[PDB]
Design a protein around this nucleic acid. Sequence first.
RNA 1: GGUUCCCUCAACCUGGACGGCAAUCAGGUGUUGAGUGUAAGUGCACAAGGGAGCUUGACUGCGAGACGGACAUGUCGAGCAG
Lengths: 192, 136, 59, 182, 79, 126, 49
Amino acid sequence: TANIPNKLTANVRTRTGKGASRQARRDGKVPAVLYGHGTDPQHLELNARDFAAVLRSHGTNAILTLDIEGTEQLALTKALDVHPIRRNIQHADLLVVQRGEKVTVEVTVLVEGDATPGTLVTQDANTIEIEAEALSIPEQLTVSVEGVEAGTQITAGQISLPEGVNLISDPELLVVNVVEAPSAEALEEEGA
Amino acid sequence: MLIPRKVKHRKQHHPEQRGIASGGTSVSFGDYGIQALEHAYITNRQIESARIAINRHIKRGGKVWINIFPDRPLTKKPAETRMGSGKGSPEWWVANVKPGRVLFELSYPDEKTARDALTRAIHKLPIKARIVTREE
Amino acid sequence: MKTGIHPEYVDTTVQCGCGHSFTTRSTKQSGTIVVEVCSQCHPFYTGKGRVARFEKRYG
Amino acid sequence: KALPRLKQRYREEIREALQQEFNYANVMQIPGVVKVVVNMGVGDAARDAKLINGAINDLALITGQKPEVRRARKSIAQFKLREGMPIGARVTLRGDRMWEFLDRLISIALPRIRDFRGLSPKQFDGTGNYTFGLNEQSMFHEIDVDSIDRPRGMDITVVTTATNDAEGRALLRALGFPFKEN
Amino acid sequence: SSSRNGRDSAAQRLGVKRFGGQVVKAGEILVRQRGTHFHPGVNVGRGGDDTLFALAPGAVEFGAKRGRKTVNIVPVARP
Amino acid sequence: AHKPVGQNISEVRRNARLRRHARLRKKVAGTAEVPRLVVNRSARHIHVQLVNDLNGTTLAAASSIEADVRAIDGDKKAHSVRVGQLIAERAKAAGVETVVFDRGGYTYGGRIAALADAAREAGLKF
Amino acid sequence: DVRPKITLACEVCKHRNYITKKNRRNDPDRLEIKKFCPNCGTHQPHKES
RNA sequence: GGUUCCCUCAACCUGGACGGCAAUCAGGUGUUGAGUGUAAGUGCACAAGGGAGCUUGACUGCGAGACGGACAUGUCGAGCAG
Ligand SMILES: [Zn+2]
């Protein structure tokens, strides 16, 4: 997988703190940090509406290309600070990367397909860890439940991975659990 | 009704109702959830009344999770007595809920029935709440 | 080894009915003792009056 | 200027046999015996203290030295056992006196067992140590049948330098233990 | 009905009496405590009830020695 | 292959001695005026030192490794007496009059006591 | 009284110097002990009265 | 109680005549989860916990300097001599 990096304009902050971050967010901006093997963090500011557009389509682990006052940089989204209620982006950790480098990333797994009609599909693990190239991170991973019968454990070792992607988490994670659909009598005894 | 087997201290101070929730603000088990928006003590009777409303609506299939447990007791002194002479005996068990906390969860094949079943349960709770999903 | 608390110990001699003899130290005061079965006598090791009456009266 | 025949036999016969069978890298790895401990856990002496006197006297005759008098380190209601009372005895044997006791047990004591069928080779302890029990005290010539009062057995254990069970049997077999073919 | 509680004991006024940097005499009480939350150091002794008192004049200094909190007395120098 | 199961007697002996030597040092300590006399005893030799614990520096030292001590025709106890006399000569030369005996975590008696009694009549008092 | 108060008197001068408590079921006999006697000026055997 | 010296538990695994979840024996892992006369708290593995030998300081005349305090009470104390 080859991903064209997303271009985003970044400005170096002049004032940091909690009084300056609140004012920055009031102007449609998000504070950010750019650490990595550069080993000297840079305090940046990003457009709030432009950053959210990149995350909406290309996933949470989006590769970026920051224009830090005329200098091009390849960066990867490492973490996000989201308000529980207002559902904002209060911060963003950015990690510097270079082409041909391996990073450890959690990607999401999706469950597609319709199983036997007398079954209920329950997904235990939301995401699994991989180790792929910097510009070759899959946007999402998929599994298929088509004709799966009764009680089966679909494990993290049976997820079909693209080339150049290696599983990091142990191959015994119960990712998808397919079980018999509960009856009406089995509902009334759960949580009493 | 949910009741702890035992507690070290049977008479306790009231739980504080300040701040927002630190943990438990995301849907982990099911596909849909109910997220609180106000502070309240959710009694163990409103949880039973709210998870039977979900059971009736979805009938047979699906699974329901209750992420809050009524651990902390509240007392009530005998009726028609003056103030003083001790502290009342415990009578009901509550759960301290802060805004952002996710209370219930549900897994069901189709969406229209799932969101209707969870709405039937928000009307039994003494607070405002909203339906949230696993997606971002 | 403390002096006045241990049982009096004697160099002994073991004799068996098969002619096998030993020389060991034991607590037997006599300094000798006879055994009717030893390592060489026993069938389990070697793999090989009531019963004498079976061959006496009946034969 | 005297050696027990088991120690005499071990020095030049048993040691060389073990070297060829396992092919050690140094002569300091050759397995050997460390001590022999003889135990009689009465347990019924909690009902009458005079019971412990029988075990004390017998072990001095069988082994050749005075025992201890072990005391319970816990009070247990179901056994009516209170902490601090005699519950058993113990004798440890090292040096020469171990070699004679191992000699008399193998040569003399074991064959006198009525319906003797040897000792199981699975009684080993994890890392090359052996233990077994007896149901009586009548298999020893040092004790006399005239002065017996009631049956009472021992619990014989041998501690060896052997690393695991494989060398434990080899050292004991070459000593002449009657192990069943299992 | 009534309450079976309602007892308590007098406050014992424990704590640290001389803080770091204070100049003290000899025999002056530094810390009153139940156990050895603080351990005696140099020129400091332990009382019968685990009180810490100064064995020589100087200035108090709190330190640590192998994970143990200690109280030491340093000899301020004569003019 | 081979893999030892328990603890050797040398490993048990080493940690047990340092266990009961640190117990000793909770009382005795060295000062410039009253230095600490530390003794190390082995199956072959015996060593002594005169340590000042404020600086952690050694004032004087004698040992049985020296050629003069090796010339003695006696037994091990005879070597201790020679070493005990050689530490009172060097300590008093350095200007030391009183010391404290740190027996090193060994039982007092035999080679340790013979060294101390030889250094007591030679001038060092403790 | 299980633990009554007892007085220890010097053997020599018979002066009553010390007072203490002992269990009269565990120690049915008169307590014998060596304590300092101010009158004699030295440590002397003391006995219960 | 004073002093001198020595030691490390509880739990679990494995092997053992009565004997079992649990008595006494043996080997291994085990850093404090055991124990501290007596409630709780602060401490104690450096042991204040476990064992042994001798013993009476469970003294006489005193006490620099302090803690705490309406007052009367209460508490700690290096050091000097017998
Ligand atoms: Zn007198």
